[PDB]
Amino acid sequence: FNSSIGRTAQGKEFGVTKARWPAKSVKFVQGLLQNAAANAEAKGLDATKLYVSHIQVNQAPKQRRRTYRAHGRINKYESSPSHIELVVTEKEEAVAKAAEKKVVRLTSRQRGRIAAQKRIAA
Amino acid sequence: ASLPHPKIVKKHTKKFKRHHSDRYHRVAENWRKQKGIDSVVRRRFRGNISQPKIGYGSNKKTKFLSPSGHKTFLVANVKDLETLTMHTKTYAAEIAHNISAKNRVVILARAKALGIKVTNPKGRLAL
Amino acid sequence: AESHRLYVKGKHLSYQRSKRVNNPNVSLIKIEGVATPQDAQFYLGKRIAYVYRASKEVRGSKIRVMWGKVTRTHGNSGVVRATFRNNLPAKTFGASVRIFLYPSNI
Amino acid sequence: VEPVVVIDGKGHLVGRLASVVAKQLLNGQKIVVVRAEELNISGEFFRNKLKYHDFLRKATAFNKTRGPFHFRAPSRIFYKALRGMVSHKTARGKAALERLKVFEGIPPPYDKKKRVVVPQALRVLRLKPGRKYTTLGKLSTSVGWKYEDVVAKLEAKRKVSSAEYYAKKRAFTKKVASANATAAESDVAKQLAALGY
Amino acid sequence: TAQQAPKWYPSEDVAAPKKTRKAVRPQKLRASLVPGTVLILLAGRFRGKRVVYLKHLEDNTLLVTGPFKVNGVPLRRVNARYVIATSTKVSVEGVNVEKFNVEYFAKEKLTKKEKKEANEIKAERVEDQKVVDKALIAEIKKTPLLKQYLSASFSLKNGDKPHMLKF
Amino acid sequence: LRSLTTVWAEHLSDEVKRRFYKNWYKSKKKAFTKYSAKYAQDGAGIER
Amino acid sequence: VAYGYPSYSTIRQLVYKRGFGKINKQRVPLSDNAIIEANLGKYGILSIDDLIHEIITVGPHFKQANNFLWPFKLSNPSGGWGVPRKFKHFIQGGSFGNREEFINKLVKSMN
RNA sequence: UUGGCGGAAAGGCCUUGGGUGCUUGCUGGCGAAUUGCAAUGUCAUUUUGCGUGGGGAUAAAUCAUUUGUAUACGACUUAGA
RNA sequence: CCCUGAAAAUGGAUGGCGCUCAAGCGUGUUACCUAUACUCUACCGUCAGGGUUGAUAUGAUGCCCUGACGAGUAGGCAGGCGUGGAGGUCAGUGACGAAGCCUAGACCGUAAGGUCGGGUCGAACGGCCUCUAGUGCAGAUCUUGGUGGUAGUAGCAAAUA
RNA sequence: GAAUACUGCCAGCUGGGACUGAGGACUGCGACGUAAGUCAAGGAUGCUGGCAUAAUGGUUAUAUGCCGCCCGUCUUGAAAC
RNA sequence: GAAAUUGUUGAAAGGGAAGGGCAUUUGAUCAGACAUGGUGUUUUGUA
Ligand SMILES: [Mg+2]
Ligand SMILES: [Mg+2]
Ligand SMILES: [Mg+2]
Ligand SMILES: [Mg+2]
Ligand SMILES: [Mg+2]
Ligand SMILES: [Mg+2]
Ligand SMILES: [Mg+2]
Ligand SMILES: [Mg+2]
Ligand SMILES: [Mg+2]
Ligand SMILES: [Mg+2]
Ligand SMILES: [Mg+2]
Ligand SMILES: [Mg+2]
Ligand SMILES: [Mg+2]
Ligand SMILES: [Mg+2]
Ligand SMILES: [Mg+2]
Ligand SMILES: [Mg+2]
Ligand SMILES: [Mg+2]
Ligand SMILES: [Mg+2]
Ligand SMILES: [Mg+2]
Ligand SMILES: [Mg+2]
Ligand SMILES: [Mg+2]
Ligand SMILES: [Mg+2]
Ligand SMILES: [Mg+2]
Ligand SMILES: [Mg+2]
Ligand SMILES: [Mg+2]
Ligand SMILES: [Mg+2]
Ligand SMILES: [Mg+2]
Ligand SMILES: [Mg+2]
Ligand SMILES: [Mg+2]
Ligand SMILES: [Mg+2]
Ligand SMILES: [Mg+2]
Ligand SMILES: [Mg+2]
């Protein structure tokens, strides 16, 4: 959502030219981060290896008002509320290894080739 | 185990998709014929979709044959299954979707005793 | 021996085609050292193998083979028509292909 | 039959050579062309100069930076004459063009490799005696190519150095011929003569 | 019920095939294949190895020996469609190939239940080969360089044209 | 025309090497230091 | 159409390879002398050679014999038409017209 | 290992000495099989990561501030341990 | 044959490239490339001509033999797919889960469509023979309701602060 | 006095390649043989090998070669500026 | 609790459209056939 906005030099960190400072969104987001961290503390998490594993924002029902246009016409004038939800998680080490054994089927002539190669070699 | 049959040939495996079912969502994929005056599909221009027509009719000796080699039959209760006692080599039973799990168990048990093949011996199986 | 080749080299040129329509079921093959249909008449019925490499393992190798035969000559320059079990992927135009000496006639 | 092919462009026809080369690219044979400034074009010089000028006039009206680029280097003139000979707008064409390298003069390592000529595209074997022909290098400078002097200088250096190579090569082969002559009139050679070698 | 019934059912009885009129008669094999010629293997494990042809077997196959002493190709069965008959001829009179037949070679396929990944030869096959070839090599030793010729392996080079090559 | 080699002087002034840094104040000022080590022998890496 | 005077060989090839009778408004291949016996026994015709003889030697029952034969269905010539362009007279180097006796070469290719 | 030549894209070419394996230039001895009548019967190179143990060196840019030879914003030019 | 005669506007078109004992022009001879065309074969359908009451076993509107044919707007006719409700039947399915909804999971039919698996679901629903109709949607600047791109854009600048 | 060219005929012989295997107790027409019987005679059989698993195959996504103008309508004519 | 439309996760492609038709490569994913009757008892629960 960045059409026809200005540029800034602060976007170089992200390799982008279009960036802004949406304070209102930031305040709400960090409000939930405090709430999630407090919930993490209650559950008994170390509060030091947590990272934002999941986060999403999706539209909420509109809140409509009226705006007044020329020649006595009426147009919609509404807000765009949001449902915000996020999940924190402790960072873990390497998950696992040792995948499937990868069973193989060999033809008879393939079997003879390996036997011959193993016979002429050690 | 099925009755011997010739090789299965269809002449057309692709489902016939309604024109512009990929363009507008409101145009369902169910095949409708294009009745337009200047529609290239109706005029059979080269490079467009092929319309369904009788020339694609499958072989009569092969029509209604499952790849296993049987004709599908829908069964709903134990009594229905007994109509296939002497026709194992041609028909295969299939339990209807609306059959309870307990009633499915007795159906499959009876079919195994009589050697009736079941196309879906996995519906609503708890394991 | 430093050379173990028992096949003659070939290049897949194109499908059978007009200006605007091509037929993938038939392929055109150029055999090295053949410049006339009469010489190419000897090469009919032989087996053709297209050897390409794949990343995933299938059945003990990285190599998968396309098997096919020639059917008849093509043109006055010794080009021949060949057909395969599965048609060549049309990405092999100009790729090298192998033509063996069996079934032999001599 | 060959990994790559190096064609000596001297005495060739730009059109006939391009058609021969273009089919080779479409067949998968890697091609490199050297000495593009000695390609010959049928017709008198002023005739072809007018043709190129008529090609110059054609450009995009509203923005000349996106119009048909009029390359002037002898290799590039050949390249355009060849580029239109291949369906370059397809992935097959783009891969085909990637197998080709057109050069001015005879550059490095290709200078140490054997060069070949195409008999059916040669000027002497294709043009009736008495007809007028052009030299691409002369034409290219008349329309804006800047580096005629340097390629003439380097080719003078290349030809000079190549002379000693052949002078050494010829002298060595003379030893081989003498040794082979002595080795003949022997029992071993008699069977080779009997068997055709 | 879900599906009512089919009124007529197809017959369960299988019908016998018609009396086929395709009798079997032996091959008219190409005249270039003569017992005692030198052949080339175009396929198999021993592909490209120059070898000797002995007898036309009953199951449309050719009895073939290396000789095993020269190059290591034993008494083996091949098909005429995968070999090339050269112009070199070896006089093979005086060898008893009549012992060898289609039943002389059997495989004894193992049961599918027994599958082995770790992994031999029959004594009679060893001595049958040893008797025959040592009788042959008394004849190969006559023509010079042919013993080395059989030990060599056939291979195509650059420039060779099989449609113009001679064998 | 193509440049093939560049041979610099053994010593550089402070002002000239400031061209090579977009932040001179927070820097180690290690400009041509190892190139300076190309000197201190008679002509090995330079005269060649 | 392209037409000419056929030879004995050419008519023999046609009836043997593509010989079909109009039996009860159906196109039945001959393949056997019995079929000709049933439908052409009235006009002294008994064998396929009897049909040929009535054709090459135009007999009293040529009309019945000829009308009995289904029209021949020929393929495109194996060696081609021999001329770059067809629809001009054979005298113009074309295909149609009265190629009087060269039709034997053409029909053999046509069959 | 010795030296020379090559800057057009040199990135290669030639050359000294010694050692080393092979040599079908020529004559001998043994092995090959069962991959069972063919199933490319796998032998090339492209990049990257992870381990070894062996050498080698210890940066800069951006944001923020500042400048105005610059500028709508970006960008440019400056300066600051 | 070629040249003069021969002047128009964006840059340009023997289709392009390019082509000079041609890849040009006049003429002749073959070889070769290919259409849903022609010859042959398989299958589908339609039409036409025929056989087959005999007991047993089903469908006599059934099964089988032979030949020919298959383009198509407006339009005509026929055989079928599906929806709401009605009479009859399967002593049909179903809280041990009906209907509905989702499913680059599966099967059948040329198709209209039919069937199953898997997840949600909680209370009714289906197969066949017939009856009946407010029975099948992409368009009508269609009606009602909902939602996008434009777009975090135009902009939120009179009345001195 | 011949040969050879060209054209045409052979119910003259023979090599190589490609695609198809429909039908399903017998009946018919034939041919070979004194007969038995056999046969290429009203539609393919025989021998052998591998695998029996995503191998073949289906679906789907992508890439490649070629082709492919937006639908409905009025109109002689619609992709229509 | 469907669709238009949207967020996150996962896969894939992307040089002035995308979408489609024929065939195939590659990746992912998916069903069946592999007991048959039978020689037969080298057998257990002895049929
Ligand atoms: Mg913008
Ligand atoms: Mg603005
Ligand atoms: Mg207002
Ligand atoms: Mg008002
Ligand atoms: Mg749609
Ligand atoms: Mg119209
Ligand atoms: Mg032809
Ligand atoms: Mg023509
Ligand atoms: Mg003029
Ligand atoms: Mg042309
Ligand atoms: Mg001409
Ligand atoms: Mg065709
Ligand atoms: Mg969906
Ligand atoms: Mg349910
Ligand atoms: Mg309730
Ligand atoms: Mg209504
Ligand atoms: Mg609608
Ligand atoms: Mg409509
Ligand atoms: Mg509307
Ligand atoms: Mg604004
Ligand atoms: Mg205002
Ligand atoms: Mg003759
Ligand atoms: Mg698969
Ligand atoms: Mg497949
Ligand atoms: Mg696939
Ligand atoms: Mg797609
Ligand atoms: Mg197009
Ligand atoms: Mg009008
Ligand atoms: Mg217009
Ligand atoms: Mg709710
Ligand atoms: Mg949705
Ligand atoms: Mg762009």
From Swiss-Prot, chain B:
GO terms for biological process: cytoplasmic translation. Its main location: cytoplasm. The modification Phosphoserine is found at residue 39. The keyword Phosphoprotein applies. GO terms for molecular function: structural constituent of ribosome. It comes from the Eukaryota. SMART domains: Ribosomal_L32e. Pfam families: Ribosomal_L32e. One of its GO terms (cellular component) is cytosol. Keywords: Cytoplasm, Phosphoprotein, Ribonucleoprotein, Ribosomal protein. PANTHER family: 60S RIBOSOMAL PROTEIN L32 AND DNA-DIRECTED RNA POLYMERASE II, SUBUNIT N, RIBOSOMAL PROTEIN L32. Component of the large ribosomal subunit (LSU). Mature yeast ribosomes consist of a small (40S) and a large (60S) subunit. The 40S small subunit contains 1 molecule of ribosomal RNA (18S rRNA) and 33 different proteins (encoded by 57 genes). The large 60S subunit contains 3 rRNA molecules (25S, 5.8S and 5S rRNA) and 46 different proteins (encoded by 81 genes). This is Large ribosomal subunit protein eL32.
From Swiss-Prot, chain D:
It comes from the Eukaryota. Pfam families: Ribosomal_L13. N-terminally acetylated by acetyltransferase NatA. One of its GO terms (cellular component) is cytosol. The keyword Transcription regulation does not apply. There is a cross-link at residue 175 (Glycyl lysine isopeptide (Lys-Gly) (interchain with G-Cter in ubiquitin)). One of its GO terms (molecular function) is mRNA binding. Its main location: cytoplasm. InterPro entries: Ribosomal_uL13, Ribosomal_uL13_CS, Ribosomal_uL13_euk/arc, Ribosomal_uL13_sf. SUPFAM superfamilies: Ribosomal protein L13. Keywords: Acetylation, Cytoplasm, Isopeptide bond, Ribonucleoprotein, Ribosomal protein, Ubl conjugation. HAMAP family: Ribosomal_uL13 (MF_01366). Belongs to the universal ribosomal protein uL13 family. Component of the large ribosomal subunit (LSU). Mature yeast ribosomes consist of a small (40S) and a large (60S) subunit. The 40S small subunit contains 1 molecule of ribosomal RNA (18S rRNA) and 33 different proteins (encoded by 57 genes). The large 60S subunit contains 3 rRNA molecules (25S, 5.8S and 5S rRNA) and 46 different proteins (encoded by 81 genes). Present with 43300 molecules/cell in log phase SD medium. NCBIfam families: L13_A_E (TIGR01077). This is Large ribosomal subunit protein uL13A.
Curated annotation (Swiss-Prot), chain E:
GO terms for cellular component: cytosol; cytosolic large ribosomal subunit. Its main location: cytoplasm. Pfam families: Ribosomal_L6e. GO terms for biological process: cytoplasmic translation; ribosomal large subunit assembly. Keywords: Cytoplasm, Isopeptide bond, Phosphoprotein, Ribonucleoprotein, Ribosomal protein, Ubl conjugation. GO terms for molecular function: RNA binding; structural constituent of ribosome. Belongs to the eukaryotic ribosomal protein eL6 family. Present with 38400 molecules/cell in log phase SD medium. This is Large ribosomal subunit protein eL6B. It comes from Saccharomyces cerevisiae (strain ATCC 204508 / S288c) (Baker's yeast). The lineage of its organism: Eukaryota, Fungi, Dikarya, Ascomycota, Saccharomycotina. The gene is RPL6B.
Swiss-Prot record, chain F:
It is found in: Cytoplasm. It comes from the Eukaryota. Component of the large ribosomal subunit (LSU). Mature yeast ribosomes consist of a small (40S) and a large (60S) subunit. The 40S small subunit contains 1 molecule of ribosomal RNA (18S rRNA) and 33 different proteins (encoded by 57 genes). The large 60S subunit contains 3 rRNA molecules (25S, 5.8S and 5S rRNA) and 46 different proteins (encoded by 81 genes). uL3 forms together with ES39L one of the contact sites for the signal recognition particle that targets ribosomes to the endoplasmic reticulum membrane. Present with 450 molecules/cell in log phase SD medium. Disruption phenotype: A mutant confers resistance to trichodermin, a trichotecene toxin produced by plant-pathogenic fungi. The modification Phosphothreonine is found at residue 5. Belongs to the universal ribosomal protein uL3 family. There is a cross-link at residue 38 (Glycyl lysine isopeptide (Lys-Gly) (interchain with G-Cter in ubiquitin)). The lineage of its organism: Eukaryota, Fungi, Dikarya, Ascomycota, Saccharomycotina. This is Large ribosomal subunit protein uL3.
